[PDB]
Design a protein around this nucleic acid. Structure first.
Ligand SMILES: Nc1ccn([C@H]2C[C@H](O)[C@@H](COP(=O)(O)OP(=O)(O)OP(=O)(O)O)O2)c(=O)n1
Ligand SMILES: Nc1ccn([C@H]2C[C@H](O)[C@@H](COP(=O)(O)OP(=O)(O)OP(=O)(O)O)O2)c(=O)n1
Ligand SMILES: *CC[C@H](OP(*)(=O)O)[C@H](O)COP(=O)(O)O
Ligand SMILES: [Ca+2]
Ligand SMILES: [Ca+2]
Ligand SMILES: [Ca+2]
Length: 326
DNA sequence: GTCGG
DNA sequence: GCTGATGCGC
DNA sequence: CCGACGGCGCATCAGC
């Protein structure tokens, strides 16, 4: 990729700040800078050139000058060599181990994959599943497998109730040739912002997918959000497909557009769009767009009849899902 | 770490 | 049990 | 310089 050296440097810094320093605003600053540089259509020749971009300040310009002159960054060189950093950066790759749990495990002398497998009794349900499928969850999902997965989920949901609509969102809906996981937005007319006329609406879909051995494990489950594990069926004598992460979010049917905007992302696109909405005097979540009073108190939800209406309120030209990726 | 007031 | 904080997730 | 930085679901735990 153009400027791939710089954007990789910035992503490594972002992850260090998140996982090791526990500094969420530096994590987000580095990612916002990586994303703006990834879209810049020239090979960056200096830090001064990069610093012209919004989200690139003095300190990133200085690291770009070091990286362009030497091909490395001394700060990352040191982070790679530091045992506590290295240990924490590894443990946080396990689903369910965040920065706080990683540091606590390193304190207890639990620092390698072999230490985790010796200590399953010290992991919660989520972490145990994270560890079981550590390699599988590393692997990306080809679009060809995502289409197979779509066909199973859409067909099994129709078997439960023809009135469900299931939409595959995330990087898949942005047209990606591969996905990190599957994200399914679910609506049913019985669940609106005015009423739940039927219990178990998410549960009955989870149950059906478990029944046909598509959903294999559960990391977390409530009334509106499932987070778990799924797997494609394989043929006679064939190697099994890797286990995959799946998220299902049940959104009130009348708030589909806000919900599909949220679930389509990217996450960096959502942060950028929601920060732009605040500048314009609105707040966006997965349900509504609301004005802000001078007070900073959100007013009543605004009428939304398309994704594009949300862009119109905040005076952005529409971006098709494919133009919302980094 | 960066930006805008 | 409930409520609010925090961790980890989307 | 300095306040703000997106917004929210589920799991877990402390205090009552
Ligand atoms: N911090 C986050 C994480 C995610 N999301 C939203 C936008 C994402 O598009 C969607 C699903 O999140 P994923 O982490 O599954 O991301 P993607 O599907 O975009 O990418 P990948 O290909 O890695 O799954 O949820 C968000 O708004 N804020
Ligand atoms: N041990 C510490 C360190 C810092 N602080 C507070 C004081 C400041 O509000 C901020 C950090 O102060 P610094 O010395 O880092 O620099 P400032 O930015 O406060 O300096 P100035 O006010 O000159 O900008 O956190 C604190 O209460 N206790
Ligand atoms: C990258 C340089 C750092 O920018 P931020 O406020 O995280 C600072 O200049 C501190 O330098 P460090 O000694 O590299 O952390
Ligand atoms: Ca995804
Ligand atoms: Ca996901
Ligand atoms: Ca949200």
């Amino acid at each position: 990729t153009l400027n791939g050296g710089i954007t990789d440097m910035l992503t490594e810094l972002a992850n260090f700040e998140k996982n090791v320093s526990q500094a969420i605003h530096k994590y987000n600053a580095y990612r916002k800078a990586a994303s703006v540089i990834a879209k810049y259509p020239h090979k960056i020749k200096s830090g001064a050139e990069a610093k012209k971009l919004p989200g690139v300040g003095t300190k990133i310009a200085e690291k770009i000058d070091e990286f362009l002159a030497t091909g490395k960054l001394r700060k990352l060189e040191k982070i790679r060599q530091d045992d506590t950093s290295s240990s924490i950066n590894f443990l946080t790759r396990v689903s369910g181990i965040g920065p706080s749990a990683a540091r606590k495990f390193v304190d207890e002398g639990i620092k390698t994959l072999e230490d985790l497998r010796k200590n399953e009794d010290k992991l919660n349900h989520h972490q145990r599943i994270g560890l079981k499928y550590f390699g599988d969850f590393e692997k990306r999902i080809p679009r060809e497998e995502m289409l197979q997965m779509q066909d199973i989920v859409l067909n099994e949901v129709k078997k439960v109730d023809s009135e469900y609509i299931a939409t595959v969102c995330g990087s898949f809906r942005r047209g990606a040739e591969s996905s990190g996981d599957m994200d399914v937005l679910l609506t049913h007319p019985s669940f609106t912002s005015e009423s739940t006329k039927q219990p178990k609406l998410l549960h009955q879909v989870v149950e059906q997918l478990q029944k046909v051995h598509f959903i294999t494990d559960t990391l977390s489950k409530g009334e509106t959000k499932f987070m778990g594990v799924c797997q494609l069926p394989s043929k006679n004598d064939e190697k099994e497909y890797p286990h995959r992460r799946i998220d299902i979010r049940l959104i009130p049917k009348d708030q589909y557009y806000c919900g599909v905007l949220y679930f389509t992302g990217s996450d960096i696109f959502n942060k950028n769009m929601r920060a732009h909405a605040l500048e314009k005097g609105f707040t966006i979540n997965e349900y509504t767009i609301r004005p802000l009073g001078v007070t900073g108190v959100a007013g009543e939800p605004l009428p939304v009849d398309s994704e594009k209406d949300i862009f119109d309120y905040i005076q952005w030209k529409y971006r098709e899902p494919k133009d919302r990726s980094e």
